[PDB]
Amino acid sequence: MPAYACQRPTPLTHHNTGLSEALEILAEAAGFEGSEGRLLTFCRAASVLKALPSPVTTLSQLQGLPHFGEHSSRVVQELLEHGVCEEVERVRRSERYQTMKLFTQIFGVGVKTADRWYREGLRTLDDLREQPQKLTQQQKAGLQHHQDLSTPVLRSDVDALQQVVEEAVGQALPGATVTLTGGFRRGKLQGHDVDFLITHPKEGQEAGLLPRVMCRLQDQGLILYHQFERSFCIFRLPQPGSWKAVRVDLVVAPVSQFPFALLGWTGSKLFQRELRRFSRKEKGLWLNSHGLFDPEQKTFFQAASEEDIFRHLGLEYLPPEQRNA
DNA sequence: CGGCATACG
DNA sequence: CGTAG
DNA sequence: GCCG
Ligand SMILES: Nc1nc2c(ncn2[C@H]2C[C@H](O)[C@@H](COP(=O)(O)OP(=O)(O)OP(=O)(O)O)O2)c(=O)[nH]1
Ligand SMILES: [Mn+2]
Ligand SMILES: [Mn+2]
Ligand SMILES: [Mn+2]
Ligand SMILES: [Mn+2]
Ligand SMILES: [Mn+2]
Ligand SMILES: [Mn+2]
Ligand SMILES: [Mn+2]
Ligand code: NA
Hints:
The record marks 264 as: Responsible for the low discrimination between dNTP and rNTP. There is one protein chain. By secondary structure, the protein is an alpha+beta fold. 47% of the residues lie in helices and 14% in strands. It has 15 helices and ten strands. α1 packs antiparallel against α2, α1 (17-32) packs across α4 (86-93) and α5 (95-104) crosses α6. Bound molecules: 2'-deoxyguanosine-5'-triphosphate, manganese (II) ion (MN) (7 copies) and sodium ion. The chain binds three DNA strands through residues 3, 30, 35-42, 44-45, 66-72, 107-110, 112-113, 136, 138-139, 181-183, 193, 195, 227-232, 249, 251, 263-277, 279-281, 286-290.
């Protein structure tokens, strides 16, 4: 088992779901306390289990697996022996964890804001609604739409949103294309938003595109909230005899950068952090969603495909459905 | 021990 | 500060 | 919390 998640296939469904979910609770709790190092180890340990070919049934099977030390091994041991890990259950039921999860789920609220509200004594969404003056416009939108934004986005929703984004993109710039990214590109059947990447085959023609797309979507009455090359939107999506709010992210890249943007925006988040970590620490190359830079020669790699990028980095190619780290 | 992704709004 | 994978 |  290789140490970086970008070195191994990780499918969306696997054979250690319960174990991975438990470790991810501890990772999330570490993030709420600002312990990014511990968050990463617990996330990486969970991801290792997702990549295994069969269920872990005995502690012996963890020996030699990367990212499994005393703490993560004890969590697995308790789940194997008793079906529950006391530390995990204590986190789950804790007021701090439950409130930080609720608050950070709000669009416009991060860990730092959630923590400050927690320390002020705030605990519920109605607590926040009862002091609306200390909210940003983004937070007000996130709070107004929070219930709809809690409802899973389904594949049927994705198909409908793609067609309306394409219509607006087509009037904004004939020939521009729309690619589904994020978790749906990795094969998820549900999600909490929809991610799209927009480009044009003629380098430079994409300049100024996103404002034109947004204006057109807004004139069609489809935009409940928006704030350039990245737009974090709330879209009005039709439903039987009504509609629901859906988070949509729209991103534009020039065609020269499209493979890097497609790779970055297809995720998973952990996969991309691991891929960038591998690039820098193992290969001496700096990777982002615009390109791949050699800081010794002072040059950018050209890529025409995701396959090119994996080759540049000396990694076997993984299709999106195997990037579910 | 230091490091832990790397951006844009 | 928020957001993104 | 774990790795190198
Ligand atoms: N309002 C609300 N937001 C939720 C709820 N559950 C999760 N979220 C939000 C918090 C996270 O920012 C986000 C996670 O969404 P997904 O699991 O679809 O993944 P995400 O789109 O971040 O990445 P992905 O595109 O799959 O790589 O959803 C919920 O019950 N209510
Ligand atoms: Mn410990
Ligand atoms: Mn025991
Ligand atoms: Mn997404
Ligand atoms: Mn998104
Ligand atoms: Mn850019
Ligand atoms: Mn996300
Ligand atoms: Mn520590
Ligand atoms: Na949030």
